[model samples]
Target: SVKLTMWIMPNSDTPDQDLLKVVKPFTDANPHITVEPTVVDWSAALTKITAAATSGEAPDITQVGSTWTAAIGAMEGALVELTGKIDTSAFVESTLQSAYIKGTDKMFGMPWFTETRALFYRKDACEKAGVNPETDFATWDKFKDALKKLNGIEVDGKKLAALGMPGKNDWNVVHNFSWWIYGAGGDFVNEEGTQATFSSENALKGIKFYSELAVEGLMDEPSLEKNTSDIESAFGDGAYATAFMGPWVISSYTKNKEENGNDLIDKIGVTMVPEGPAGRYAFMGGSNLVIFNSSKNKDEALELLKFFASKEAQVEYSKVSKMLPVVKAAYEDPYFEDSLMKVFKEQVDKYGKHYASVPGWASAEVIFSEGLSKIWDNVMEVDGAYSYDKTVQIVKDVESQINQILQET
Candidate 1:
């Protein structure tokens, strides 16, 4: 008999309850084994996990941000290697990059689920603005024009905002900025991950593009003070015409229909992230299930991980979590046939990008977000003036800081 302690972040509003639906079956199947799960908010998960890992008191199994896998594995014997223990081929190939320690074949994490961002726009708002979302949202230039057209348009006598993007206050600032950076043929780091390239010409162009939106008043100025959750909620309430979000919004709106019987899910239309000068792109990320080396019951924990990665558990959890299942076989489920989900799958399969799985990235991303988030402050300082030169300086400064972190790592 074995009892396992597992820690998971709030992948949804009710992650604890959502997890129960999947784990109940597992516990029933393995009557001798029981599990206790703790749901932590993203804001606290990182600090707590770091403390646990350093103190050698981590739970038997823990869910970590996919990008954090490499950093955690760098903690030296903190995680159990799963290279030969699990069938790696069962999961999506791209996700395996984060599962392994940087520059090594050793695997320390299992790709449990996957998610990618896309443009979620209101069909009614697009029609009102005389903008065809299907065509106008194809490129960044056209998409910006569409937003300008949608701005200040009255919907039922109320003004509708063109965009609901969060600013520096949000944890997802880096992920949000990634779309523009990658789409412009820019990268956060060089090919070898030995240096930072966020100051490159192409990267500067992407930074300037996103910065201009706020400076030009295309995005809601006051809304910039909000976080990702607030922005998503505002978008759902018909307060904003468009937003960049993952699949969770779709399932939540579908399952928890409004009392007015007019759910935003029905009115929303999703598109691949608009193309920049170089190409279309989106930030792809998801949680990974990892077993800590401190756990005594490695065998039982391994069994639990296998169960989670199995097609049945993956499909069931994906249904509740509204995240893409990592297991290849789970894609065969009919749940993915929905048009909304199909758009996300297309983005993930073709244009998805993960943060570089380097030990320094976890620390470097913090400096990147802190510096990039200041773009809005600069915009406001100049009283709506968007200076390309100023944005370049910001990126240059951030790149210097990032390079230092990489050097130390």
Candidate 2:
């Protein structure tokens, strides 16, 4: 029997009960193998992993965010490229592509679960506003029109918030808004990555567009201080008719419905995010499973990796965690035939897009989000953020910063 350890985020959506149930069969089948699971918050895990790697005491396997794949792989060679072990053909092409480093054929991690954002709207509210609930939101302009219409209608004896904007919270405001900026033919980095480009015109335009939602009072005024959980709860409470969120919100929505015995579950619907000038886009957010290079039991570790990638495990995982399954085959399972799962699958298939693959993606996320906070909070003007003559210059700045990080590595 091989003793193996795995580390995961403490509060991450890893359904431990479900995992234990599925893994029990594996242990029963191979009585020689034993598994130890460790859970830590993101911040603590980062520190612990670093210390473990330095002390030559790393776990056999670990779960990592896609954004950290490149950096962690580069540092201490923590990632094990599973290109040969796993069947890459079964996974989504776009998602698999992101797992690789640019220009290199190496895949450092296997996708465990995947998620993407979509337009979550209130069906009843849309109809009451004299707007078509099924209206195609192909462009940002059309999306704005729908929000404007909803804003004009009274619901629960009050004018509903057109949307929720967590402006004061830099992460939500910037990263969420960046989807539009990058989608609108703007970029946060240039091909040669060497400088900060948060002040670029294209970046500014994206920031301005989202900021305008707040400036015009189209989003909930109180949402500036709210986190994602708060925003979702507010939506579920019927405080807003439309919002942009991910599939994970479905779990909370489902829970609220059950707890309150509400019928709004039937009224909730999702759609591809509205297209921008560049095209329809939404951020791809998900975690990955990785086997540390320091693992002594490489063969057994690979076996477990294969086990998680199996079609059965994926379906069972999704059922227990309420997360969208990573494997394409999981979509075909009877489980997703439920309306809520169908909506999530449709959104991922039709409109999902992820941030550019880069070694410094986490840092870039911070830079982008923090920059948006500065702009929306009136600390800086959009034009002054990046003193460039055109939006193209802004894209160049972002590219330069990313390329610089790539070079340093």
Candidate 3:
């Protein structure tokens, strides 16, 4: 018999209960395994887990945010490398990338569930701007033109801003900006993952495009002052015409309609991320399941992980949590039959992108996001003054800061 402890973040309000429901089949078949689950809030999970890793108090199994995989895996002997133990081809390639340590083939985590952002718009607002989101929102040129037409427009008596997103105060600053950065052929780091490349020519162009939206009054300034959570609420209230958000919003919006009588659900429109000079790309984010090397129940933990990776378990969890499954086979399940889900799935399958899976990424993201926030602040201060020279300098400064962090790590 084996008793295994697992630490997980609250993917929903009742994460422990959700896990129980999803893992019932595995527990029933493997009665010899007793899985104990702990739910930790994201805010404090990092510090708690870091302390546990060194003290030998870590759980047998843990669900870590995909972005933290490299940092956690970097702790010498903290995680069991899964390179040959699991079949990598079974999962989504983009999400799986985060499981590997930078510059090596060693995988320390298994992608559990994943999510990606896409363009969510208001159909009525699009009509007011004389834009067809289905066609016009396909490219950056047309998308910006539509935003210009939609800016400051009134649809059904409520003024609508062209777009809504958050600023530095939000955890998603880098993720929201990733669409622009990646679309312009810029990545967070060079191919070797040893240096920052955010100051490259293409990256700067992407940064300029995002900055111009604020300077030109296309993005909602007030919404920028809010965090990701508040921005979503504002968008639901019809304050903005479009927002690039993850799959969770679909269910959240639906829940809002049923519980609070919000009609934004019916007027919602979904589309792939618009294309840029390089290609259409969006951020991939979610959690990964990993086993601590210190666990006495290593083999049992591996069993549970393998069970979670199964198509049945993945689909079951996705249905319960309203999250997209990391495994490719789970997509064929009827739970993903909705058209909007297909849009998000397509983005993940063909256009998803993630940060470099390097140990330094944890610190680098904060530096990167803060840099972007400062640029937005400057844009607001000037009030519509666009300056390529200023942006160029800011990006260069930020790049050097991030490079230093990467070099140290």
Candidate 4:
């Protein structure tokens, strides 16, 4: 048997177990092909994988984050040009665009899932507060007021939080913040990407609005210290009335239904985020599956990607992984037919945007997030230490640093 090793990120889908199911048909049909899969932690994803690629120890196939399409693909010269190799015509536009190594005609990956952040609120809580998903929280100001009203409600002898937000340092929350920025009619970079745009007037407006959630007490206090993991777990257990999160958290509710016979996801309410000056939008954030140039079995790797892209595999995987599918046809299923999931789906198709895919995006993201951490620290302190004027300067400083990152050859 020809051995094929696949390295993928750690997912709740029982990667090795469920993936065995995917390969059963393929392997049984061939018999000569045997597969081995490994799932790694996000903490060391790029480091370990990139190191493997540089040393010619790369897997035959790999599942990589969308952002890595450029970094691990372009910078490391590990990703092969897939311009004419695979069919990505069925993928979402923005998601397919993310697979390109910015400014180059070459693409290095195929879209696995089209992901974004959406409003996660409990329907029972909204009804209790007399809030309407259609029109009640139509604006940022109105949304804030609604959350405040939802706060202090008693549920099973415990108080419920107004909303759950990941206020600390997390890559997911950064994109969540980007959604807010997009809604404010601002962008992190100009369309040309030659200069930083976070300090622009529109971006400043976004910064002002997003930074006030904690100050206004419209969000759960403990959530201010929590990261992505804590936010999802807390929200799943009903510690908060709502959460701002990506679609993967859907598993939390699906599990709830399996465990309690109540389809909690059915009762969970969703809508586009309340509009800013620009109206609602979400970040096009998810992963892709790519083949490394170092891989010897390119033909088999290509077939692996085609299998994952098939509607049958995509649908089954979405059910197990709770991630949106990249194949447009996968939405015809009842799982994607759910009302809450449909909202996230509609947002991705209609209002999703992606990050600036500059050559230096990885470095820029690190420096930019460090700057945001400073703002987050002061806001969490609630000491009035960071004035609007002072915060503006801090953003300006961040812009300077980002510009430097972009300048790195």
Candidate 5:
């Protein structure tokens, strides 16, 4: 019997009990191949992995995030390059690129799952507002119109929030803002990651659009003042009609709907982030499977990868996790071929984007969050009167803050 170690990140929607059970099929097929699991929080998975690699005792198979692809792959040669062993062309292009070093085609991991934010809304809310989720929210202008109709909606004696914009200092705001920036055709950084473009006229316009949501009373004011947790709570309470969120929110949404009899699960529908002058877009992230260089069971580990990465296995995993499958043809499966999963698949495959995937971006993300908060504060200072020109200057100042942190070149 050949025993192998596998480290899994506990970030997906599947329950821990079910996750470990997924291995039963593989182990059943290869009765002699035993998978010893080290399940850990996603936050600590990397720390454990680095230490394991350093000590030459890394797991044979590990769940690595797209963000860690380069950091772990190149930093210490921790991952076994899988270029010739796996079929890269069968995976989604964006996801395939994430497992490879940015500039080179050398594969360091096999993609397992991926994510991108989308406009998740309640079908009942949209229909009540006389809007078609599939077409009414097709463009940002149309989406805003739908929101206007959805405002002041009364449910259980309370006015529902058209959209929950948690203006507080949270990463949620940054995530929500990406769609507008990309929609207006803004690129986060230039080709070299040397120049920041958030200051450009087009991008400032997008930033201004996000800030305007608050000024016009379109976003729930209370939700903006509180943290994102409250925003999610508001969404479930029918205080929110639409929000930009990840697919992983499905499980929690269903739970809240059942507990409160909110009719959220059945009424909900997801659509691509509305199009702007450029196109529809959303931020993408994922977890990949990697075999460590320290692994002694490479061949056996590859056999495991083959089973897990197959289209059928991917579809099953995605159904349980509510994540986008990395395999292209897996999108054709029943789970992704209909309803919300279908919408998410389109956004991830056709329009998902990643920020500059360098190590320095980690430092830059914190500063960027600060920059976004400052922008919101600047707009809140002026209250109801929305000024596009004034917002441009604010973005210019915010741009310099971002530029300062990104001065790695």
Candidate 6:
């Protein structure tokens, strides 16, 4: 038997029991293979994995976040090009597109699962606010108008804000708020992946829209300190009329329903986030499975990868993880017929956008988000924060920095 080792982030939703159950059949069918799995917490895993790569002892297969794929793939030469290994025609084009490094056209990983953000709302709250809950509030103007009306409603003697927006650190709020700018044909980086453009007129316009939400009191009071987790919990508690959130919220919402023994689940609704003047967009979040080039068993590792990509494996894994399957066939499974899962699948299918793939994207994201946080915290006016001239400079600076790093690489 070919002994194979795999590593996964400890926080991954892939249940240990489920993984074993799913892989056992594969092992049984392919008696020549044996699989060993290891789980490591995010922090320790990063440190240890780097050490392993440097020591020439990296695992054969590993689970990596999409955001880190390019860096990791480039760093340890630990990624294999699987362009012709499987039938790409069977998967979502966007999903496949995410696995390649921009410019190089190198395929480094296979998508395992995906998560998308959308507008989560309270149906009852909308009705009480004299707003049509089912209306196509797909644009920023309509969303703002709806929020104005919804904010007027009193929920249990408290005024309901349209959304809970986090502003304290600016990472989540700034990044998400910038989606409007991106949708509107604005970008934080130039085509070459160097320079910053956080102060672009379009970027500033997006910032102003988000700032207006705060100025108009459509944002929750405690939202400045809230992270994604807190916001989801608050929403389940009926704290806001609506919020932009990820599909993972469904798990928590379902749990809350069961714990409360109420019909709260039915009250929750999901829709694509309202569009900007440019277009509608969403932040893509998911994991990818990759084969390290340094592995002693490349052929076995590839087989293991193909195993995970199989339709049957994807369906079973997604069922346990509560994440949307990367394989299209997984969506056709009967398990998705369950109400909450069905809603989640629908949102995934109709509205999902991956983060742009650009070298030094992480740093650019930080710079842009920091600029946005300043605007949100009232440290700077929106116009001043994202001014066209300032944004051009920022993009230029980012470009220089990225090019310097690329030269080193």
Residue 337 C-alpha lDDT in model 6: 84
Worst 10 residues of 1 by lDDT: 253-262
For all predicted structures, in order, the TM-scores are 0.96, 0.85, 0.93, 0.93, 0.85, 0.82
Candidate with best TM-score: 1
lDDT of each: 0.85, 0.68, 0.84, 0.77, 0.74, 0.68
State the local distance difference test value for candidate 3: 0.84
User: What TM-score quantifies how close candidate 2 is to the native fold?
Assistant: 0.85
Tell me the tens digit of each residue's lDDT in model 6 across 178-267. 467666667655565444555567766775676667666777656755566677777777778898876666666766667776555688
lDDT of 4 by residue, 1-409 (tens): 6788898776654778877786677788778778899988775776776787688878888888786667777656677778888776776566787788777787888888767788888887788777776776678888888888888776667688888877666565457678777888889887766678888888888878877776677777667676888888778777887777777777766877788775657767777777777877777778888888888888887877888888878888777776788898887787777776788878878888888666667667667657776666667666666577767887889899888877674
Off by over 4 Å in 1: 255-262, 382-386
User: Which ranges in model 3 have alpha carbons more than 4 Å from their true place?
Assistant: 382-390
Q: lDDT-based ranking, best first?
A: 1, 3, 4, 5, 2, 6
Candidate 1 lDDT, 313-370, residue by residue in tens? 9999988878988888988988879788789888998989998888887787678668
Candidate 6 global TM-score? 0.82
Q: Write the per-residue lDDT of candidate 3 for residues 1-409, one digit (tens) a residue.
A: 8888999987764789889888889899999988889998765777777777788888898998888899889989989998899988888777888999878888999999988888999999988789898899999899999899888889888888999988766458888878799999888788888988888888888888887888788998767766788888788888899998887776678878999999998998899989999988888888899899899988889989999999999998777666789888988888788888888888877888888889888777667667777777677674455566767887888889888988986
Candidate 6 contains a number of clashing pairs equal to: 8
TM-score of 5: 0.85
Which prediction has more favorable lDDT, 3 or 6?
3
- Summing lDDT over every window of 10 consecutive residues in candidate 6, give the lowest-scoring window: 379-388
What TM-score number comes out for model 1? 0.96
Q: Candidate 2 lDDT, tens digit per residue, 1-409? A: 7987888763224545546776776778778888787776654555576566566688998877666666565555666777778888777766675676655678878888777767788888888987775664567788787788888467768668888745554345545765777666665556534344555666667656766676666766567656676787788877788888877677667776788876566787887777777776667767788888888998998888778777888887777666677787877788888876676677666766565566666566555555445444442244454322333444445556555665574
